[model samples]
Target chain A: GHMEPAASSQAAVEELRTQVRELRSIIETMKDQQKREIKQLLSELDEEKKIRLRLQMEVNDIKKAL
Target chain B: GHMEPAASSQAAVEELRTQVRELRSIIETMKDQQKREIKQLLSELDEEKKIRLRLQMEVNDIKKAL
Candidate 1:
C-alpha cells in the first residue's frame, strides 16, 4: 500500500519545484543575452549604413569633379 | 493512512513535468529564432561590405580619371 510515497512525495514535489525555478531563471537569462546580441548587430548594421552613405557622397563629389 | 496525497502527488508531478517540457521547448524556439535573426544580419552586413568595396573601387577610378 502507501509505504514511502508520503515523505518521498514531498521531497519529489520540492525538487520539481526547484527545477522549475532554475529553468525559469535560465530562460530569463537567455532572453536577456539574445536581446543584447541582437542590439549589437543592429547597431553595427546602422554604422555600416552610415559609412555607405558617406562613401556614396564621396563618390558623388568625385563624379562631379571628373 | 495517506489517502489524498498519493493520487494528488502523481497529478502534481505530471503537471510539473509538462511545464518543464513547455519551458524547454520555448527556450529551443527562442534560440532558433535568434540564430535566424543573426544569420540575416550577417548576410546584410556582407552585402553592405560588397557594395562599399565596389564603391571604393569606383572612387579610385574616378580619382585617376580626374
Candidate 2:
C-alpha cells in the first residue's frame, strides 16, 4: 500500500505535464485568433483614414467657392 | 498487481482534472489581457479619427482664405 501511493504520485505528475501542454495549446489558439482580428481592424482603420483624406480635399474645393 | 493499476489510473484521472482547471485559469488570464489591449488600441484609433476630422476642417478654412 505504501509503495502504491508513491507510484501513483509519479503517474499523476506525468499526467499533469501532459494536461499543461494541452492547455498551453488552447491559449495559443486564442491568442492567434485575437491577433488576426486586431490586424484586420487596423487595416480597415487605415482604409477609412485614406477615405477621410480624400473627403477633406473635396471640402477644400468647396471652401474655395466661399 | 491488477488492482494497483486501477487505483493508479483513478488517481491519475483526478490529478488530470485539477491540472485542467489550472490550465483553463491561465488561458482566461491571457485572454483578458489581450482583450484589454485590443480595446485600448481601438480607443486610440477613434481619437486619431477625431483629430483627422478637425485637421480636415482647418484645411478647409485655409482654402477659403486662399
Candidate 3:
C-alpha cells in the first residue's frame, strides 16, 4: 500500500487547530482596538472559513481519489 | 485489506467543517449578544480546540497502530 492514510488527515487537523487559535488570539488582541481592528478581525474570520472549507474539500478529494 | 482508510478521514473532515460553521454562526449571532453570550462563545471555542486536538491525536494514533 502506497498510502500513508493518516498523514494528510493529521495535517488537516493541525491546520484547523492553528486557524482556531489564530482566531482566538485575534479576538483577544483586537477586541480592544479600533473599529478598523474589528474589521480586520472579520476579514480574518472570512479567511478562516475559506481555509476550513478548502482543507475539508482536500481531505474528501484525497479520500475519493483513493 | 479490510481498512476503509478514507472513511474515518472523511468523517473527521466533515466534523471540522461543522465546527467551523458553528463557530461562524456564533460569531455572527452572538456578537450582538450580552457578555454572557460571548462567554458562552469562548467556551465553545475552547471546546473546538479540544476536539481538534483530540481528532488529530486520534489520527496519529491510528497511523501508529497501523
Candidate 4:
C-alpha cells in the first residue's frame, strides 16, 4: 500500500481511514447505514479539511491582521 | 491510491491510513473502543492544535504590544 503523511492531517485522515476500516470490519456484523455513514462521514470530513485549506490563505490574512 | 503530494500532510494521512488498516486487521481481536478512541483522540488532537494555535497567537499579541 502507499504511505500517508506523518504530520499534516494525519489525525483526520487516520480518523476516516479508521472508520472506513471498522465499518468494513463489521460489515457483516453491522447495518448498511453504518457502512454508508462511515463512507459518508469520511468524505464529509475529508472535504471539510480541503475546505479549510481552500480558505487557508484567508486564515493567513486574518492572522496577518494582528 | 489517489495521487497526493509527496511532501505535505501525506505522511500524516498515510500514517492514519495505516492505523486504519491495522485497526481493520485486528478488528476481530481489538475492542471497538480502541477504534473509537483512535477516532476520538484524532479529533481531540486536531481541536487541541487549533486551541493551542489560538493561544499561541494571543501570546504573540501580548508580546508584540510590549
Candidate 5:
C-alpha cells in the first residue's frame, strides 16, 4: 500500500481542473461568436450602403437625360 | 516535508477554483459588450433599410421628371 498525498487530493483536483480548462474555452467561445456575429452584421450595413449609392449612380444620369 | 504535499494541495485546489470563477466572470462581461454591439447593429440596419427605400422614391421622382 503506497500512500501518496497528492494522488488522492489531486484526483478531485483533476475534475476541477477539467472544469477550469473547459470554462476557459467557454470564455473564448463567447468572444469568438461575438466577433463572428458582429462581422456579419457590419457586413450587412456595408452591402446596404453600396446598393444605395449604386442606385444613385443609376439615377443621376436619368436626371441629365433631358 | 512529509506534511507539505497535502498543504500544497489546498492552495492548488483554491487556485484552480479562482481561475474557474474569473473565467466565468469574463464570459458574462464579453456577453454584455456583445449585447450592446448587437443593439447598435440592429438600429443601423433599420436606418439602412429606411434610407434605401427613400432612395427608391428619389429614383421614381427623377424618372417622372423625364
Candidate 6:
C-alpha cells in the first residue's frame, strides 16, 4: 500500500493502483466482449479520457495546441 | 492447444483443472455482471488479489532501493 514509505512512492503507487483498476475494468469488459454491454461502453469512455489526458498534456507543451 | 508445438509445446500444460475451476468462477461473474445473481465474485476477488500482490511488489522494491 505504502510504496515509497518516503512520500515520493505514494503517487506512483496510487497511480499504479488506478492503472490496475482501469486494467481490471478493461478485462471485465473483455469478459463480455461478445455481448458488448454497458461495461464496454464505460471502458470506451475511460479510454477516451486517457486519450484526452494525453492530448491535454501534449497541448501543455506549447509546441502543440489543442 | 500448444503454443510452441515442439517439445517445449509438448511439455506438460499447467493444471487446466485448476484453471478451469478458476475460469468457472470468472464465468459465474459474467452471469452476475448481467444482474442475474448467483455471482462468482471469487474469481473477481482473485484478480484483485493479483493487483494487491503487484502493489506489494512495488512497495518491496522501494525497500530494495531498486
The number of the candidate with the highest TM-score is 1
Q: Which stretches in model 1 have alpha-carbon errors above 4 Å?
A: A1-7, B1-7
Q: lDDT, candidate 4, residue A28?
A: 49
Q: Which candidate is the best by DockQ?
A: 1
Best by lDDT: 1
Residues A1-66 of candidate 2: C-alpha lDDT, one tens digit per residue: 333323466676776677678777887799789979889878969887797879767876776788
**What is each candidate's DockQ, to 2 decimals?**
0.59, 0.28, 0.07, 0.12, 0.46, 0.03
Colliding pairs, model 5: none
Higher-TM-score candidate of 3 and 4: 3
lDDT of 1 by residue, B9-61 (tens): 77878877787789879988988888888888888888888988888788788
Give all candidates' CA lDDT scores. 0.80, 0.76, 0.61, 0.61, 0.77, 0.50
lDDT of 3 by residue, B1-66 (tens): 563334677686757767776886776555556445555655665566567557656655655654
Measured with C-alpha atoms, the lDDT of residue B59 in candidate 4 is 57
Chain B TM-score, all predictions listed: 0.83, 0.81, 0.45, 0.47, 0.69, 0.39
* Candidate 1 vs 6: which has more TM-score: 1
> In candidate 1 chain B, where is summed lDDT lowest over 10 consecutive residues?
B1-10
Two-way lDDT contest, 5 vs 6, winner = 5
Q: lDDT of model 4 at residue B55?
A: 57
Report the Cα lDDT for residue B49, model 4.
61
lDDT for each residue of candidate 1 in A4-41, tens digit (9 for 90 to 100): 43368768796767768897998889789878979987
The 10-residue segment of model 5 chain A with minimum total lDDT is A1-10
In model 5, what is the error at residue B35, expressed in angstroms?
A: 2.5
Task: Give per-residue CA lDDT, model 6, range B1-66, as digits (tens).
Answer: 554311221222233234446656766777666553213334444555565566556556555753
- Output the worst ten-in-a-row residue range by lDDT, candidate 2 chain B: B1-10
Flag regions of model 3 displaced more than 4 Å: A1-7, A30-66, B1-7, B34-66
Docking class of 2: acceptable
Compute the DockQ of candidate 2.
0.28
